[PDB]
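Supplementary notes (optional reading)

For those who missed the lab, this is the record we used. Protein: Tankyrase-2. Length: 208 residues.
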Amino acid sequence: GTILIDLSPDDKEFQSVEEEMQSTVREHRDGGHAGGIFNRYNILKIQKVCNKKLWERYTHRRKEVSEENHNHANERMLFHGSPFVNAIIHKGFDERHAYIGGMFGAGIYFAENSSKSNQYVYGIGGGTGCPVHKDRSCYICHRQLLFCRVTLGKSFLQFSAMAHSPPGHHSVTGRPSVNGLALAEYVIYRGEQAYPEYLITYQIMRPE
Ligand SMILES: Cc1cc(C(F)(F)F)nc2[nH]c(=O)c3ccccc3c12
Ligand SMILES: [Zn+2]
């Protein structure tokens, strides 16, 4: 039931999503091992993701969380990158793959840094990189990220040295406390708490 609508590069909406992608690239402590070496992207396509059922699922859960959190959904726009992106756009986020988890436990992870989500496009640790060249820093092959509407509700703040939610909380905020340029990561435990609003097709660019 999913439709993808191309945005024009002349459209303010395209431009805004591109700027959020470009402006949230940072350096990573792996020197580029997982995601590649780059400071910016070549954005090839930005599509709006339209699915009435998945949207309704999301707004129903958002209402539940908002009411539990004293009329505050605490809704954000966040990146998600993974090998599941093609499944997600059609069937929604699925918490039966929360067990994979990460530094903040089982759950579905989102990032404020686009470049953090870029590290997961080819799997955990970048997997073995792109299918065609087996290169985690491939400048040729096209990548995809989602830019998602995410309901955090009452979020448990977890400082980081870089499953069900904590009792009474709807999500976890993983906040790096050592790297002062690293933005937060977030974890949800119900797939209905995120909607994949934009599908972004891009290349990382080789620094000049
Ligand atoms: C931990 C993890 C695992 C996976 C998965 F296993 F590949 F699905 N995808 C992720 N995708 C992200 O966009 C992200 C953002 C911030 C922190 C972690 C993650 C993340
Ligand atoms: Zn490649």
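If you only remember one thing from this example: Residues 1-208 form a domain with the Phosphoenolpyruvate Carboxykinase; domain 3 fold (CATH 3.90.228.10).
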